[PDB]
Design an enzyme around this catalytic site. Structure first.
Site, PDB file in Angstrom:
ATOM      1  N   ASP A  28      -7.841  -1.596   1.234  1.00  0.00           N
ATOM      2  CA  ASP A  28      -8.616  -2.657   0.738  1.00  0.00           C
ATOM      3  C   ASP A  28      -8.191  -4.086   1.029  1.00  0.00           C
ATOM      4  O   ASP A  28      -6.896  -4.316   1.153  1.00  0.00           O
ATOM      5  CB  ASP A  28      -8.625  -2.340  -0.701  1.00  0.00           C
ATOM      6  N   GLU A  43     -10.497  -2.774   5.231  1.00  0.00           N
ATOM      7  CA  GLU A  43     -11.649  -3.483   5.176  1.00  0.00           C
ATOM      8  C   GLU A  43     -11.522  -4.741   5.163  1.00  0.00           C
ATOM      9  O   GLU A  43     -10.723  -5.295   4.406  1.00  0.00           O
ATOM     10  CB  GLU A  43     -12.361  -3.243   3.826  1.00  0.00           C
TER      11      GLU A  43
END
Ligand SMILES: [Ca+2]
Ligand SMILES: [Ca+2]
Length: 557
Positions: free
Chosen positions: A341, A384
């Protein structure tokens, strides 16, 4: 421009692709046709949306696993399946009784296990699960308007990377999930965070004795309760108003939390956030000092958390701690990969370090467990970085096997009523990705849910070159859920299991057929593409290794 279709059988020049007289299966309808004049004639199945998924009829099983062909299924575990309701309200968590926008609904690891045969029927090769690590125990105010209590039901507010969050299950439950997944051909990705820690919450402040309140002595007990986390907004207040009991200035109290050596934050007397991407604070989450080169010791509040598995290690920095802690899960359970993330907001040699140690952990597990390892593939890591596209960027040099592709959502939205429009994108992607992988999707937990075009989504997604990401409930048109005044919340709604065998069962079967076809031909995700010119419709050939497929779409209606 966009091709129209008779609704009548369809004649195809397979002359370049399939020998003469050879048997060609349409995987969708299962009809087998023999080639006559370099031609076959097939009627697409009624539920096919005009598709013919033409394979050599000799093929009879799924192809060996390849990340460049992978079908990744992304689940928010708390929102998927409640296998065990005895663990639904751990650490004093409650439901809100008002729409449950941000509460733990109860999905857990045992329920996800229960659902593995369903997932392999959907052709899923990789199961990306939300971080199972112990979250912050309580809640913060949700939305711009304090509309609801927001808990860490999504796994992004981690507090202790060495424990499982008790809402998820225990060690036995994780190991049973991973080993059942492997016995079925499904690899396991953990979702992972190193940029930030969770928020401070009333429950954690009370339980681990950190922070500070305005209230003193008997006022604490008079205003907050015996359990501070159990507070409700009064008249005219919102769910943000509990902040007005917390003294976020106080030096002594807030030094008893993570520590000045661990995070940057406006709270207390800590280094303040920066203005660049690496050192800034997202949504007032505290940024971990991943770049620090100085030994930090444990988070100070761990002094009060007796059930942690974390242990001081001489000379480790916060980064060293995180990458050790993350790696132990891999070394102990054989996790196949990480989805990472906020990858833009941590410096790249930190990710490289994470990847170094995770790969050594997976190698070491596979050597210890020759009976459980499906193969020898190295650890896999996707990331991401907001708005990344179809580019082999710097991330590839620093430990990322593939980045999440933000540009596909819009490309597929354009081609809702005309599959043929994907052609351009599909050509470029097939070309480009001969040299590197990406992960493409339609629906995201921080974008929107792709619900145009119904089950057409299936072929819009599963025919993509590169690895694809089914967001859970894509196969069943899971509705956008309650959201309050946080626009992203409704994307994390409950899996619609009643629909799966009722109103949406046809959508699911359509998804099943197309996804099995993909699992069956690495040409789909990794092959080079030649677009055919046909007398009616749209079509193409993908070829990779010794595997050729021909995919034909008839036309509108
Ligand atoms: Ca549960
Ligand atoms: Ca950062």
């Amino acid at each position: 421009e966009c091709p129209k279709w008779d609704g009548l059988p369809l004649t195809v020049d397979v002359s370049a692709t399939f020998p003469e007289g050879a048997a060609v299966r349409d995987y969708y309808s299962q009809q087998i046709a023999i080639v006559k004049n370099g031609q076959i004639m097939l009627q697409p199945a009624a539920t096919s949306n005009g598709l013919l998924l033409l394979e050599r009829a000799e093929t009879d099983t799924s192809a060996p696993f390849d990340w460049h062909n992978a079908t990744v299924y992304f689940v928010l575990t708390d929102r998927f399946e409640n296998g065990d309701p005895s663990n639904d309200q751990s650490y004093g968590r409650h439901k809100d009784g008002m729409a449950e926008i941000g509460t733990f609904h109860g999905g857990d690891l045992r329920g996800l296990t229960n659902k593995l045969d369903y997932l392999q029927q959907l052709g899923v090769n990789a199961l990306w699960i939300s971080a199972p690590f112990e979250q912050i125990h309580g809640w913060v105010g949700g939305g711009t308007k304090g509309d609801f209590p927001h808990y860490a039901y999504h796994g992004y507010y981690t507090q202790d990377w060495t424990n499982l969050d008790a809402n998820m299950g225990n060690e036995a439950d994780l190991r049973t999930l991973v080993d059942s997944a492997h016995q079925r051909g499904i690899r396991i990705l953990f979702d992972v965070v190193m940029n930030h820690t969770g928020y401070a919450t009333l429950a954690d402040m009370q339980e681990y004795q950190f922070g500070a309140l305005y209230l003193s002595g008997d006022e604490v007990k008079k205003s907050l309760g015996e359990r501070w986390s159990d507070w409700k907004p009064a008249a005219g207040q919102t769910w943000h108003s509990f902040n007005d009991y917390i003294n976020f200035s106080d030096k002594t109290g807030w030094d008893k939390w993570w520590g000045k050596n661990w995070i940057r934050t406006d709270i207390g007397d800590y280094d303040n956030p920066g203005f660049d991407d690496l050192t800034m604070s997202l949504a007032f989450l505290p940024d971990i000092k991943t770049e620090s080169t100085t030994a930090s010791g444990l988070p100070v509040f761990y002094k009060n958390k007796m059930d942690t598995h974390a242990k001081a290690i001489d000379g480790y920095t916060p980064r060293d701690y995180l990458t050790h802690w993350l790696s132990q899960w891999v070394r102990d359970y054989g996790i196949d990969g990480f989805r990472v993330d906020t990858a833009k907001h941590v410096e790249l040699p930190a990710w490289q370090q994470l990847k170094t140690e995770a790969s050594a952990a997976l190698r070491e597990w596979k050597k210890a467990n020759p009976d459980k390892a499906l193969d020898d593939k190295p650890f896999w890591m996707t990331g991401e970085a907001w708005g990344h596209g179809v580019m082999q960027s710097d991330y590839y040099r620093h430990g990322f096997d593939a980045m999440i592709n933000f540009d596909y959502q819009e490309q597929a939205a354009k081609a809702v009523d005309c599959l043929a429009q994907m052609d351009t994108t599909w050509q470029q992607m097939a070309e480009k990705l001969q040299g590197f992988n990406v992960l493409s999707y339609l629906s995201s937990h921080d974008t929107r849910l792709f619900r145009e075009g119904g089950d057409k989504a299936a072929e819009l997604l599963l025919l993509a070159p590169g690895a694809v990401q089914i967001f859970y409930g894509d196969e069943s048109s899971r509705p956008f859920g309650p959201t309050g005044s946080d626009p992203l919340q409704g994307t994390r709604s409950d899996m619609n299991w009643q629909d799966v065998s009722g109103k949406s069962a046809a959508s699911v079967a359509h998804w099943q057929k197309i996804s099995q076809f993909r699992a069956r031909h690495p040409a789909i995700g990794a092959g080079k593409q030649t677009t055919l010119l046909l007398k009616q419709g749209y079509g193409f050939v993908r070829e990779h290794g010794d595997d050729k497929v021909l995919v034909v779409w008839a036309g509108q209606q």
